[PDB]
Design an enzyme around this catalytic site. Structure first.
Site, PDB file in Angstrom:
ATOM      1  N   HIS A   1      -4.653  -9.843  -0.730  1.00 30.70           N
ATOM      2  CA  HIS A   1      -4.786 -10.040   0.704  1.00 30.70           C
ATOM      3  C   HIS A   1      -5.923 -11.004   0.992  1.00 30.70           C
ATOM      4  O   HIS A   1      -6.876 -11.115   0.216  1.00 30.70           O
ATOM      5  CB  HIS A   1      -5.092  -8.714   1.397  1.00 30.70           C
ATOM      6  CG  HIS A   1      -4.194  -7.586   0.994  1.00 30.70           C
ATOM      7  ND1 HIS A   1      -4.353  -6.890  -0.187  1.00 30.70           N
ATOM      8  CD2 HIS A   1      -3.159  -7.000   1.639  1.00 30.70           C
ATOM      9  CE1 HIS A   1      -3.458  -5.922  -0.248  1.00 30.70           C
ATOM     10  NE2 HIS A   1      -2.724  -5.967   0.849  1.00 30.70           N
TER      11      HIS A   1
ATOM     12  N   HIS B   1      -3.457  -0.311  -4.854  1.00 33.27           N
ATOM     13  CA  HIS B   1      -2.929  -1.501  -5.509  1.00 33.27           C
ATOM     14  C   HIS B   1      -3.436  -1.493  -6.944  1.00 33.27           C
ATOM     15  O   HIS B   1      -4.541  -1.945  -7.226  1.00 33.27           O
ATOM     16  CB  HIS B   1      -3.379  -2.761  -4.760  1.00 33.27           C
ATOM     17  CG  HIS B   1      -2.872  -2.830  -3.351  1.00 33.27           C
ATOM     18  ND1 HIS B   1      -3.438  -2.110  -2.321  1.00 33.27           N
ATOM     19  CD2 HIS B   1      -1.823  -3.494  -2.812  1.00 33.27           C
ATOM     20  CE1 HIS B   1      -2.759  -2.323  -1.209  1.00 33.27           C
ATOM     21  NE2 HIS B   1      -1.772  -3.160  -1.480  1.00 33.27           N
TER      22      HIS B   1
ATOM     23  N   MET C   1      -1.472  -6.726   7.473  1.00 30.92           N
ATOM     24  CA  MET C   1      -2.396  -7.743   6.973  1.00 30.92           C
ATOM     25  C   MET C   1      -1.920  -8.476   5.714  1.00 30.92           C
ATOM     26  O   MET C   1      -2.736  -8.827   4.849  1.00 30.92           O
ATOM     27  CB  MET C   1      -3.746  -7.083   6.680  1.00 30.92           C
ATOM     28  CG  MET C   1      -4.340  -6.324   7.858  1.00 30.92           C
ATOM     29  SD  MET C   1      -5.747  -5.302   7.371  1.00 30.92           S
ATOM     30  CE  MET C   1      -6.051  -4.343   8.879  1.00 30.92           C
ATOM     31  N   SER C   2      -0.617  -8.716   5.597  1.00 32.50           N
ATOM     32  CA  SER C   2      -0.098  -9.388   4.405  1.00 32.50           C
ATOM     33  C   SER C   2       1.340  -9.848   4.598  1.00 32.50           C
ATOM     34  O   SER C   2       1.807 -10.022   5.725  1.00 32.50           O
ATOM     35  CB  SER C   2      -0.110  -8.408   3.234  1.00 32.50           C
ATOM     36  OG  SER C   2       0.960  -7.471   3.384  1.00 32.50           O
TER      37      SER C   2
ATOM     38  N   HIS D   1      -7.281   4.162   6.106  1.00 27.50           N
ATOM     39  CA  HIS D   1      -6.491   3.826   4.924  1.00 27.50           C
ATOM     40  C   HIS D   1      -5.892   5.049   4.229  1.00 27.50           C
ATOM     41  O   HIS D   1      -4.845   4.947   3.580  1.00 27.50           O
ATOM     42  CB  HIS D   1      -7.344   3.017   3.938  1.00 27.50           C
ATOM     43  CG  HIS D   1      -6.564   2.392   2.818  1.00 27.50           C
ATOM     44  ND1 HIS D   1      -5.372   1.727   3.014  1.00 27.50           N
ATOM     45  CD2 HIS D   1      -6.819   2.318   1.489  1.00 27.50           C
ATOM     46  CE1 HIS D   1      -4.926   1.270   1.857  1.00 27.50           C
ATOM     47  NE2 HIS D   1      -5.786   1.615   0.915  1.00 27.50           N
TER      48      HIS D   1
ATOM     49  N   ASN E   1       1.757   4.653  10.577  1.00 24.76           N
ATOM     50  CA  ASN E   1       1.069   5.284  11.691  1.00 24.76           C
ATOM     51  C   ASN E   1       1.450   4.636  13.000  1.00 24.76           C
ATOM     52  O   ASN E   1       1.959   3.517  13.024  1.00 24.76           O
ATOM     53  CB  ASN E   1      -0.452   5.168  11.515  1.00 24.76           C
ATOM     54  CG  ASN E   1      -0.933   3.717  11.485  1.00 24.76           C
ATOM     55  OD1 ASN E   1      -0.763   3.019  10.482  1.00 24.76           O
ATOM     56  ND2 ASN E   1      -1.527   3.257  12.585  1.00 24.76           N
TER      57      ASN E   1
ATOM     58  N   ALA F   1       2.895  -1.702   4.149  1.00 23.65           N
ATOM     59  CA  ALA F   1       2.612  -0.551   4.991  1.00 23.65           C
ATOM     60  C   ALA F   1       2.207  -1.209   6.304  1.00 23.65           C
ATOM     61  O   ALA F   1       1.392  -2.135   6.298  1.00 23.65           O
ATOM     62  CB  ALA F   1       1.446   0.241   4.410  1.00 23.65           C
TER      63      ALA F   1
ATOM     64  N   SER G   1       0.814  -1.218   0.000  1.00 23.63           N
ATOM     65  CA  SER G   1       0.000   0.000   0.000  1.00 23.63           C
ATOM     66  C   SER G   1       0.848   1.270   0.000  1.00 23.63           C
ATOM     67  O   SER G   1       1.723   1.440   0.853  1.00 23.63           O
ATOM     68  CB  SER G   1      -0.933   0.011   1.216  1.00 23.63           C
ATOM     69  OG  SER G   1      -1.861  -1.062   1.188  1.00 23.63           O
TER      70      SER G   1
ATOM     71  N   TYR H   1      -8.129 -10.657   3.365  1.00 20.77           N
ATOM     72  CA  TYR H   1      -9.366  -9.927   3.653  1.00 20.77           C
ATOM     73  C   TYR H   1     -10.210  -9.592   2.422  1.00 20.77           C
ATOM     74  O   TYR H   1     -11.356  -9.179   2.559  1.00 20.77           O
ATOM     75  CB  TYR H   1      -9.109  -8.660   4.489  1.00 20.77           C
ATOM     76  CG  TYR H   1      -8.226  -7.608   3.845  1.00 20.77           C
ATOM     77  CD1 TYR H   1      -8.671  -6.862   2.754  1.00 20.77           C
ATOM     78  CD2 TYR H   1      -6.936  -7.372   4.321  1.00 20.77           C
ATOM     79  CE1 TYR H   1      -7.853  -5.910   2.147  1.00 20.77           C
ATOM     80  CE2 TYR H   1      -6.116  -6.424   3.727  1.00 20.77           C
ATOM     81  CZ  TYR H   1      -6.577  -5.699   2.640  1.00 20.77           C
ATOM     82  OH  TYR H   1      -5.752  -4.761   2.054  1.00 20.77           O
ATOM     83  N   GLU H   2      -9.651  -9.782   1.228  1.00 19.49           N
ATOM     84  CA  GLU H   2     -10.371  -9.511  -0.023  1.00 19.49           C
ATOM     85  C   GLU H   2     -11.243 -10.701  -0.383  1.00 19.49           C
ATOM     86  O   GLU H   2     -12.068 -10.618  -1.293  1.00 19.49           O
ATOM     87  CB  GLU H   2      -9.398  -9.281  -1.182  1.00 19.49           C
ATOM     88  CG  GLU H   2      -8.662  -7.962  -1.183  1.00 19.49           C
ATOM     89  CD  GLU H   2      -7.604  -7.915  -2.272  1.00 19.49           C
ATOM     90  OE1 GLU H   2      -7.955  -7.763  -3.461  1.00 19.49           O
ATOM     91  OE2 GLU H   2      -6.413  -8.047  -1.945  1.00 19.49           O
TER      92      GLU H   2
END
Ligand SMILES: O=c1[nH]cnc2c1ncn2[C@@H]1O[C@H](CO)[C@@H](O)[C@H]1O
Ligand SMILES: O=c1[nH]cnc2c1ncn2[C@@H]1O[C@H](CO)[C@@H](O)[C@H]1O
Ligand SMILES: O=c1[nH]cnc2c1ncn2[C@@H]1O[C@H](CO)[C@@H](O)[C@H]1O
Lengths: 282, 282, 282
Positions: C86, C64, C219-220, C257, C243, C116, C33, C88-89
């Site tokens: 990912h 992406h 998350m990846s 995001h 962050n 990220a 990201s 979550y997709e």
């Protein structure tokens, strides 16, 4: 989907076994990686390949022959799974634990589980035997559980307790028996933690596991214990510490399945002797 | 596969409810194990069995009647789920949380969630009420999430924040209300941790959970909160501490669903009074 | 079910790419990201949308682009995934990691992964670059693993070690290179922890993660590293700290995001320069 076996499926498989052997076992033993040797001490043995028993899954992992052996061990009639099933092979937990419910329907009352595990506890040495006094079910935390889906009342209750999963009396017996063997090292006892696999752990994961209070890490057993306790089987088990997990980034080597199997033969004579002597206690 | 409901499915179900009742609720309440009594204080009530509402799943757990009840509680118009859905029943999270999105389409703005939980915090006593100030989503750590799959922009954003999930203002209100009730015990507040179930935790797992900073453990709620916050619902919730989890291997007894339901009736009069009084604050 | 791609599927896709470009990359880079800018420094570039490459999945996440770009970066021939997949997709891990095995069949030997991440380590500041020296695979603990199912011997072994996943030599190179850049802040290094997503973490979850020894959360990446090491690829990677995660309940704001993508452009010039210079070392 959830469990695909109906009560009848377990029943059919049990009837098939009952009609093909005169053996009526009271104890069931599940052999883990490098523990398949325990079978060679059985007398009046009868073997069945998993592939010939109706609703049975198949072992695909090296060190898991994939045979159901009935026989007499130190006077006790028992049945042994020479090789087990794991989630990392692509099997759902309701497939992994199929044999456990069939055992209950055969009239089995005690289930002893064995496995090869990585040692998290620093006091552990390769070759150690650790009685499992408790477990941490990681897959279970996320809902991956052999009991997920509608409950079969004919086997057990909807919300089974797990705090008393590992039989206290049998663990006392294990300790007394070990003393009679005159072994040099003490019999270890601890918490077994299960994760999915099939890759081995990173340093960060091992430190995390140890800090959670786990003594040994492995990729099986827990699902079988859940189902065993759910249907009322007395459960006892132990891990063969096959290696010390890497805890520092200045790691010399790295874990491998070969070391696990090699370790199994090394302790074979020892743990086989242990399990056979343990048969005297029930 | 991922979420099987399209925006239209939620919409159809919402229209069906709107065309069968004149009730226009602003608050939605989800009743957990042994909390189904909260419904009997509703005035001008109208009940719908989950089985008669088009795209609705069904409760299979004892203590979960499986009825949607609209009514007026202490002047506020609300709708109550007398019984909820859990992942251990075989339901995917997108099924478990279906009612939450339907509520949003009914025009509901506030969601209060309740549940029965095991106390991890040593200061907790059976019968305690714990305001949920935060949660730890174990299933979520592994990707099991009601939001997994393509995002429905009509409901919310792709990456919703969860740090402010439990409404601060409502928790202040809960504390002031509790004081007015003149109760003897203080209102607890803590972190709720969710795991899959359906078996109860081992000693090792409980120690691990407590050390992660969890105050109470349960098998639900979190999925509903995620979806609720994703679609913009104000969320408030509490756990009824139904038992103290076993933390020592010299365990006397073992957890059971009966104790949970029995505890529910004991605190019924108390928590029902609490929720009804809470309706005055919005 | 488990992995749906057979060795031939990876092979076909590799042949298709080989027959459509004269580029023969030795390094593969996966852009996370807000890192899609790394692509614009390639010379003699050729782009392929994921949708035109036979067995390729598609990116659905903002930030992406979903393009495979071959080109020459600082003298080295490489291929870049401008955007990744990912869990979550809605993608299974065997889909998420498809490109990694295709890369191996293209003749790629080194894989650099980027992402990220939220900073857990208090010493981290937004904009920091953290070399990944190790990872904690949460989804893996529950059995969600790209290697679950029968093992493809043509790619690797059944039980691959992960303790040496992040190449030591490349991390030494990264540190020397950073020094030559004359940067003001030091290059961070730490443990990356992966969870499923797509929601952001609660305060309780962050404290828990940090206490497990994690420095950054995302998350990846981990799935790609597992498959990469399984097939013998040298792996190196880094996280862009986008962050500081909220660790107190008196939280001012909440993760989004947008902040992640905005941070990407800010560090673009820096990390792009870093990766290009890193190409000189192999
Ligand atoms: O260090 C270890 N970590 C995880 N599993 C292990 C370890 N040692 C033995 N096993 C167990 O043996 C097989 C792999 O050899 C797997 O089935 C695993 O359950
Ligand atoms: O000690 C506990 N551990 C886990 N879940 C619990 C506990 N006590 C209550 N519940 C909750 O009540 C049902 C079981 O009675 C489950 O639905 C669970 O969510
Ligand atoms: O604080 C964080 N927690 C978890 N994932 C994060 C965080 N910051 C960045 N990402 C990563 O960026 C996307 C969301 O913006 C996700 O794909 C996640 O992997």
């Amino acid at each position: 989907m959830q469990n695909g076996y109906t009560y009848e499926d377990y029943q059919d498989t049990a009837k098939w076994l009952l009609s093909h052997t005169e053996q009526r076992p009271q104890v069931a033993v599940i052999c883990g990686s490098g523990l398949g040797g325990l079978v060679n001490k059985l007398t009046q043995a009868q073997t069945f390949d998993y592939s010939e028993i109706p609703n049975f899954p198949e072992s695909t992992v090296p060190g898991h022959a994939g045979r159901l052996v009935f026989g007499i061990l130190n006077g006790r009639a028992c049945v042994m799974m020479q090789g087990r099933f794991h989630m990392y092979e692509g099997y759902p937990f309701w497939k992994v634990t199929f044999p456990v419910r069939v055992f209950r329907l055969l009239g089995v009352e005690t289930l002893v589980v064995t496995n090869a595990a990585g040692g998290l506890n620093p006091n552990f040495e390769v070759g150690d035997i650790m009685l499992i006094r408790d477990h941490i079910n990681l897959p279970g935390f996320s809902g991956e559980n052999p009991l997920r889906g509608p409950n079969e009342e004919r086997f057990g209750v909807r919300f089974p307790a797990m705090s008393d999963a590992y039989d206290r009396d049998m663990r006392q017996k294990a300790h007394s028996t070990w003393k009679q063997m005159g072994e040099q090292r003490e019999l270890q006892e601890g918490t077994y933690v299960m994760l999915g696999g099939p890759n081995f752990e990173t340093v960060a994961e091992c430190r995390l596991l140890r800090n959670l209070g786990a003594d040994a890490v492995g990729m099986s057993t827990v699902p079988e214990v859940i189902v065993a306790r759910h249907c009322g089987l007395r459960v006892f088990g132990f891990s063969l510490i096959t290696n010390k997990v890497i805890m520092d980034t200045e790691s010399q080597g790295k874990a491998n399945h070969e070391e696990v199997l090699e370790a199994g033969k090394q302790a074979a004579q020892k743990l086989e002797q242990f399990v056979s002597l343990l048969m005297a206690s029930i």
